[PDB]
Design an enzyme around this catalytic site. Sequence first.
Site, PDB file in Angstrom:
ATOM      1  CG  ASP A  64      -2.146   0.985   1.042  1.00 41.80           C
ATOM      2  OD1 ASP A  64      -2.470   1.400  -0.109  1.00 41.80           O
ATOM      3  OD2 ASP A  64      -2.717   1.351   2.099  1.00 41.80           O
TER       4      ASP A  64
ATOM      5  CE  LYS B  58      -3.152   4.987   1.249  1.00 39.76           C
ATOM      6  NZ  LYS B  58      -4.557   5.490   1.349  1.00 39.76           N
TER       7      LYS B  58
ATOM      8  CB  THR C  54      -4.748   3.412  -2.745  1.00 38.23           C
ATOM      9  OG1 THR C  54      -4.904   3.269  -1.327  1.00 38.23           O
ATOM     10  CG2 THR C  54      -5.498   4.646  -3.225  1.00 38.23           C
TER      11      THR C  54
END
Lengths: 388, 387
Positions: free
Chosen positions: B190, B192, B229
């Site tokens: 993840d 981001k 995401t």
Amino acid sequence: SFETRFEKMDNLLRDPKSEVNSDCLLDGLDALVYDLDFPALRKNKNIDNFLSRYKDTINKIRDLRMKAEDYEVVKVIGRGAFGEVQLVRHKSTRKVYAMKLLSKFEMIKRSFFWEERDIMAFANSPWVVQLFYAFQDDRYLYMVMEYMPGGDLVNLMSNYDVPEKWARFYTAEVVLALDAIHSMGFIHRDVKPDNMLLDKSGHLKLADFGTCMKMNKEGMVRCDTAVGTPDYISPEVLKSDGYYGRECDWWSVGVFLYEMLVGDTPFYADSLVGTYSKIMNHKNSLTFPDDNDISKEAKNLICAFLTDREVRLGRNGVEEIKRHLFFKNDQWAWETLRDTVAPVVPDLSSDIDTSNFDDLEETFPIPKAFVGNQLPFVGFTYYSNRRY
Amino acid sequence: SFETRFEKMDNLLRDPKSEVNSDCLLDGLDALVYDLDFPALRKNKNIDNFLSRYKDTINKIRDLRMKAEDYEVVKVIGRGAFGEVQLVRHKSTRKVYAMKLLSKFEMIKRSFFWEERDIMAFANSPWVVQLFYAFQDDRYLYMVMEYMPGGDLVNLMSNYDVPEKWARFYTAEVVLALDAIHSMGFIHRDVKPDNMLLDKSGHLKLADFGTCMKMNKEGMVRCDTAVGTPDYISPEVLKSDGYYGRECDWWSVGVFLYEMLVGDTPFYADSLVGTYSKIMNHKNSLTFPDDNDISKEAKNLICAFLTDREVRLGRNGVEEIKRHLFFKNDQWAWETLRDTVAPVVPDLSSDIDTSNFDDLEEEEETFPIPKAFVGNQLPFVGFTYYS
Ligand SMILES: CC(C)(N)CNc1nc(-c2ccc3[nH]ncc3c2)nc2cnccc12
Ligand SMILES: CC(C)(N)CNc1nc(-c2ccc3[nH]ncc3c2)nc2cnccc12
């Protein structure tokens, strides 16, 4: 305050008398695992996953913590409906101990081990048998106690026509031992020569704290069930509505003194009833042999104990028993008694000699739902800091 | 051996990484009490007596041990399906921390906190947000983490036109932070800008280890569910049969570099479909708009990351990423990077200044009352941790 809280918690984990010490907490996890590991309950994802997660960790803990397999049965010395009393040996150390086993199935189904565990663990009395370790499994409660190589007074009485001087010594020691129990706030309720053990030196120590009940502010106990051995049971415990005090323990001392000096229990019968009938009519059933082998004072002490509650010696405390003429001797003193030379000093081959003891030789259904059978026993685990 | 066993047991109780340490054992008793204290279950003598016996000691323990009431909400900074993320202040010490709350109820409706708890607790890395405390009650799991006053890279990107020199600094720091995670045996999954936090000095720390998965002997992971995401999700995680390695984390770095330099994510769309479709077709959808701004090396690094996993930069380890020309600079070395002066140094009024974080607002659905033992607290026994 921040670190105060962690310190208070650390002492909660430290304290042997604490309900949430490390061993009490390990008890909880162990209980929870035993109480959940059943196929019907494992259909519950929460229960199934938890058990999977803790499988390895619980097997490690179970291996590390004290278990039945750490001890070897040397001899079976006692037997009850609740379990056995056996002389064991720690497999690694080779030290001889006494182990009392209590069936968890029998505890739950018609019930006391708390006070038995507490008296032996924290009494710190030369009159009470010390408890070294207390542990358990899903089947039994175990109590590893100090080994008493001299055996019991039943064994002594079976080998001798107990002379008065000896009877005076053992009666005095039981009085002190009982006064110690009473000062802790308990009535023994099962005082008998089978529960009087002799140490290497030949001095007495009390055993079987399994019927011990805590007295109230008036020093009394509310009990409607008969407790103790038919021969030693007092009239008040037999008659139990029931509201009695520490005087029932003194009645048993009078039975004990009679037994030593006469060779038989004063109210012996061919049956449980007839024994109970003789106790009730102690007024006309208490007789002594027609010979000069029992002194005036010995007979008076027996009679001062073998009466109804309200007229019994010890209703105004130990001092009235301690002051009795039977105890007047040019051999010992009350404050120096456990330091004097005992009448019979055990002549043991080694510290592991078990000669003075005669050798003798189903659990819970599977739950379909959580029942928590191990919950009454969480906190029973106890380990002594004593080294050898 | 006799004494040995007590010592081994005494170590197990002490060990913070142990499953049976004093705090997990306290977790067990606490769980058991919460799950048994219901009128229907109290009809069982064993359960009733146990609860009566432990009433006083459970109330003492509950009062002594860390609780939600020890902290004060300063600001709400995040909101997931599993709970909130808030900036808190310990009522006694007045120190500001970040607190992640996870609804034990919601979690029971199809369940990861273990690795998130473990990475943040035992990472001992200047690249991973430190977890100071982990505690719980019958409703929530709580994670008290170190406060990062510079805010995240999303906030940074929204306030500035990131010059390529800053983009190099933040990319390099994420590379080091991700390399740290991989060395612990995890793939972040993840990556981001929302999970890249800045400290008082302006240095990056990776956060939210909620999707972290432990690699196998082949440094791989078996997962059939999409994670992360939509904009940063790699084609391999999107295509998940699924058997992928740490290279999915490097794809996300290339998305991050593109975003900083371009001002938009490379595969953006007005839906979770439009975007997912743009990723699967990365070979034709990756384009750089008209400019003299983005350098040759920057574009090459983006492209070396935005390819299929068997040709992606980082398939032969960090050194091939570290050696890329884009990172050639005079100011810093890889070994001197976290000691250099950051491109943006937070201008904070105090150590308790929360201005780099946007404040969000703040009657919950909870477990039904059981008529039988269900053991809802059991998945969470052992979560308590105090550094
Ligand atoms: C022949 C006997 C003495 N009557 C056996 N019965 C019991 N013995 C003991 C006991 C305690 C400590 C000891 N140390 N060494 C030996 C020894 C024996 N405890 C009990 C507790 N509840 C019931 C019966 C007994
Ligand atoms: C806008 C934000 C910062 N991205 C909010 N979302 C989340 N923030 C944090 C977090 C951790 C440590 C911190 N220290 N100082 C601040 C701070 C924030 N953890 C998470 C964990 N899982 C999901 C979301 C988040």
